[PDB]
Amino acid sequence: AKIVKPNGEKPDEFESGISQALLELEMNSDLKAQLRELNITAAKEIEVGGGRKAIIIFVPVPQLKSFQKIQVRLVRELEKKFSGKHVVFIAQRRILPKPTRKSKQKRPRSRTLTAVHDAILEDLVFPSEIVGKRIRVKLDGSRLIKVHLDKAQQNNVEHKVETFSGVYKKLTGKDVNFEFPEFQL
Amino acid sequence: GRMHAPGKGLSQSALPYRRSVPTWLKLTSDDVKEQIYKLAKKGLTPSQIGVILRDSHGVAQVRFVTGNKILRILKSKGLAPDLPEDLYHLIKKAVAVRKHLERNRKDKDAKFRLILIESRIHRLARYYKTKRVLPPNWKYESSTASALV
């Protein structure tokens, strides 16, 4: 159907249902001419601390810029067709290990793990562009990243920072908090 | 500080931490690539191409609106100059100070500055020979100064 995987395996019920839901969502809207080559790769269902849920949707890299300017609408047709499930878009990226002397093309530095994590964090929320990043390193030796966002479009992002922290702790495992600075601009 | 001067200057650019295309820019990558091609057929050095594009077309840098830097597109199309910009300007300055020193034999300050220009030409030539940009047989002489523009 609309779901296309890089590997030959059958998807589950949930991501097939999300693909069908977006199939009628592009069918009944005026965006059918803008999603002819725009597809979905995979989707999951995870949990966040509290009484809320979350969903993640994977997008390939060379079609990501098509989904960047359509994301501002597509998310809230997804909450107007759901009850309260907040919807985020992320770009998929493969990870390669460091080539040790114990174990071929040179691995390009776009596949660097910290670069992949940084790209995941910046592309996790689009309209609140990051303006600052600090790392709290507490006395137990663990790191606690805090990320500063844009002053503009603050009201439509502030209700989803807990979901952002939950999905970043689920996919990667870093305690990430969000703050809104007001000093600069 | 400087490399042949006692000054210790702090005056250069400072690019912002934000690394995204601003919303006020309504240009694509192919349009600014075509502008680079047209301004290179106008025959100008890539740095001043960046100056004119930043001044007139509102673009911050090409490398933040296109995935690659300006000399790399200029080499990919096949119209970049064979000699680098700073080497060409250093050789031009050497030609200028030598042409000044032919008619003025008593200018010792100009002779000292000619020594400094020749030393910087040699030190840049070593690096460009190292990075396999220039052939190993290219040597800088006064007689080849007027021959190579």
Binding site: K133, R134, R136, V137, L139, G141 | -
Partner: protein, 129 residues
């Protein structure tokens, strides 16, 4: 020019604790610098520090306490074994009861008692007490 960022970092934090300041900035970052402050933070000689993640090289805001006496750097990084470490500990620590030698072995960067326990050696960075 700047040929050792770690020596300048430890000299700056030494001057800051000697004057009596509470917060200091270190202009460059390195992974080895973060490991060094992680060793001193696990040993409780410096407070909880920060990383100013700017796209050039991270600036480090270290909280200073009065528990630090001197931070030093041995340049260059001298090769040290298990049999030759006792001489360094004798002529470089102020006493046998306190002070630590930070040396880089293949299993990480930490104090010399832990490297004694794992029976490994390497190159020395510096000291603190």
């Amino acid at each position: 020019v700047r040929m050792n960022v770690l020596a300048d970092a430890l000299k700056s934090i030494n001057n800051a604790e000697k004057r009596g300041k509470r917060q200091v900035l270190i202009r460059p970052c390195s992974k080895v610098i973060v490991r060094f402050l992680t060793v001193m933070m696990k040993h409780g000689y410096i407070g909880e520090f920060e990383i100013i993640d700017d796209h050039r090289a991270g600036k480090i805001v270290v909280n200073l306490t009065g528990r630090l006496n001197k931070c030093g750097v041995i340049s260059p990084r001298f090769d040290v074994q298990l049999k030759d470490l006792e001489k360094w500990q004798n002529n470089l620590l102020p006493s046998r009861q306190f002070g630590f030698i930070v040396l880089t072995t293949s299993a990480g960067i930490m104090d010399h008692e832990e490297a004694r326990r794992k029976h490994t050696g390497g190159k020395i960075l510096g000291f603190f007490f």
